[PDB]
Amino acid sequence: LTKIDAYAHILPAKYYQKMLSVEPNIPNMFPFIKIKTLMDLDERLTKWPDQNTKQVISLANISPEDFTDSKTSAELCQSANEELSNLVDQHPGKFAGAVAILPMNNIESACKVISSIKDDENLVGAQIFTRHLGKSIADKEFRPVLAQAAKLHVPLWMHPVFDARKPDNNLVFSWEYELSQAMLQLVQSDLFQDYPNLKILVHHAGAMVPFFSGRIDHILDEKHAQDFKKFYVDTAILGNTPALQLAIDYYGIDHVLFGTDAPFAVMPSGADQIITQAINDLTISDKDKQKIFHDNYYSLIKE
Amino acid sequence: LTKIDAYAHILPAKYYQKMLSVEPNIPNMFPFIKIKTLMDLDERLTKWPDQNTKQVISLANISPEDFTDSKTSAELCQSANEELSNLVDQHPGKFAGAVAILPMNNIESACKVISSIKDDENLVGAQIFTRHLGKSIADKEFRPVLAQAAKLHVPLWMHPVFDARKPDNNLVFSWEYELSQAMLQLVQSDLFQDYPNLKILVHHAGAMVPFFSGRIDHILDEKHAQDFKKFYVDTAILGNTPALQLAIDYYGIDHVLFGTDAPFAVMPSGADQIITQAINDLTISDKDKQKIFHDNYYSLIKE
Ligand code: NA
Ligand code: NA
Ligand SMILES: [Zn+2]
Ligand SMILES: [Zn+2]
């Protein structure tokens, strides 16, 4: 037993410095640059939250697709993935694996990224967002990428982004609504009808689905209602034992993975402590806790 | 024996016919008109869900303020509240009380309605929506109405409405996000700092709050995070025992009230049975179940 934090975030120094050359106004546009452990690898390693934790690292949301053309974005993402792969290789007692960035403005190249994940031990999946370039993840534009991941058995990490079209976006509730929207949009566009074996890991314990499963069941038909159960979820809800229990009740124990949203929310290095405590406070077996902390991650990434 | 369903909906026959003369596009724009237990009283009573249930009745969201001017709206709301009061008086073994409509385009008249609730035994509170006139319920314009209800110890029923400014509104998730936005907007505009004894009952079990309380506690300061616990909630989430448990853990047993959203979602007459079952399946005491089914409502309505 060792704890695998399946959803932690990083900004690798060379990629970050490449993205500053693309737009030097980025430290103004993105407030989370302040967090030292996101930016500074030695800071992260020094103030490491638990010695019994390894992290699965993915890029924080400064994606090249939002700043450059299709070709330059593909080059920047390949470079970022290479750097991410190196970080796991170089620090294998700290990083369990890395989640690759996709150039969603370059569909051909994004498909190549999915294919390259099988060829690299350090790259463990790819990260998708609830919206790419102002379109839903469920948009036909990105469906080939999702189809490729299903075909090759690559697990996808799904992350929220603010929808700028919606007024009153905030850090409290908007991202969770965005996660729920995206799942609904994927489900109703027949994603799991076409690809039942596709694995998506959803940030923040499946967002609004466990609490409002009663609605899903009564609004959607049988096949689509049950398709919401195909998602895997992390535990990144900052504690909350009974909410994590509700998530297990809906998804089953094998779909719930330890995840923290590190280094965010808890300074300096994320919420490893409060989340670990909340999983430990669950009235479930030790086998079940080991699945959450450890086993479910390895089931997810099996190829 | 008696359960009090604190959040059930009704379209009183005379009121609905008055509204049809204002807008003939009403059955077209509002699809839920086909539910015959909502608008036809004898149908509702014939097909009554449970003999040991009394309902607290509020209007479904066809409100004068969205179609008529401030004078006509105030007039129509007064006529609706009178008919609502009449329905309870005339059928006291079915209706435990009624929730009044506010003309939020007529603040003067809205305040008078809050005042009228003390004068009338059949009216037990007033209904507010998450947005009125395309503005937040937290807008300064509506604040004297909330202030009056706090002053007069009138409880308010809060109901979601689609925010038309946001794309991709659906029946699964969008209403729950709007309740959560509303609560945050009220808390952060110092509603419970100015009026800590104000009682607002929130539809759908506090929406996203019990699941994402960890997010609330880590983003907002002490006083505003804890203000979210001042809301009372119903049990209108279509079953889901462990989610109901999550809400009890967050709000405490005194703040969780049986409510169905009747007659919606479950034909012909609402989800009384799946929700009653859900509450009976909770691993709590009979006293606690009694509070939920019955006692919390009567504490809520105490003047
Ligand atoms: Na791999
Ligand atoms: Na009264
Ligand atoms: Zn995150
Ligand atoms: Zn309702």
Spell out the SS3 assignment of A201-220. Answer: EECHHHCCCCCCHHHHHHHC
Task: For ligand 4, an ion, list residues with CB under 5 A.
Answer: B 261
The encoded tokens of residue B139 equal 């807008």
β-pairing, A156-159 vs A95-101, is unpaired
Number of continuous H segments (helices) and E segments (strands) in chain B: 15, 10
A170: chain B residues, CB-CB within 8 Å: 184
Q: Technique behind this structure?
A: X-ray
Q: How far apart, in whole angstroms, are the C-alpha atoms of residue B146 and residue B224?
A: 18
State the DSSP H helix or E strand holding residue B82, giving kind and residue range, or none if neither: helix B70-90
Q: How far apart, in whole angstroms, are the C-alpha atoms of residue A36 and residue A31?
A: 12
Q: How far apart, in whole angstroms, are the C-alpha atoms of residue B182 and residue B188?
A: 10
CB-based contacts of B101, cutoff 8 Å, min separation 6 = B59, B63, B64, B77, B80, B81, B84, B113, B126, B127
Give burial (CB, 10 Å; 0-12/13-18/19+) of A42. exposed
**B255 marked as binding residue:** no
β-pairing, B156-159 vs B200-202, is parallel
Contact across the interface for B240 and A213, Cβ inside 8 Å = yes
CA B77 to chain centre: 16
B265: chain A residues, CB-CB within 8 Å: 215, 218-219
CA B243 to chain centre: 19
CB-based contacts of B71, cutoff 8 Å, min separation 6 = B106
Mutate to test the interface with A, among B183, B184, B189, B212 (most CBs of A within 10 A): B212
Q: How far apart, in whole angstroms, are the C-alpha atoms of residue A272 and residue A258?
A: 9
For B261, which DSSP code?
-
**B227 marked as binding residue:** no
Per the annotation, binding residues of A for Zn(2+) are: 9, 159, 203, 261
Contact across the interface for B237 and A215, Cβ inside 8 Å = yes
Per the annotation, binding residues of A are: 9, 159, 203, 261
Instruction: Give the domains, in start order, of chain A with CATH numbers.
Output: 1-303 (3.20.20.140)
Tokens 């809400």 identify what position?
B247
| Integer CA distances (angstroms), A301 to A52, A127, A146, A153, A211, in order | 20, 13, 16, 8, 27
User: What is the SS3 assignment for B184?
Assistant: helix
What would the DSSP string read from start to end of chain A? --EEEEEEEE--HHHHHHHHHH-TTHHHH-GGGG-HHHH-HHHHHHT-S-TTEEEEEEE-S--GGGTS-HHHHHHHHHHHHHHHHHHHHH-TTTEEEEEEE--TT-HHHHHHHHHHTTT-TTEEEEEEESEETTEETTSGGGHHHHHHHHHTT--EEEE----TTSTT--TTTHHHHHHHHHHHHHHHTTHHHH-TT--EEESGGGTTTTTTHHHHHHHS-HHHHHHGGG-EEE--SSS-HHHHHHHHHHH-GGGEE----BTSSSTTT-SHHHHHHHHHTSSS-HHHHHIIIIIHHHHHH--
Q: Phi and psi dihedrals of B158, rounded to 5? A: -100, 125
**What does R_g of chain A's alpha carbons equal in angstroms?**
18
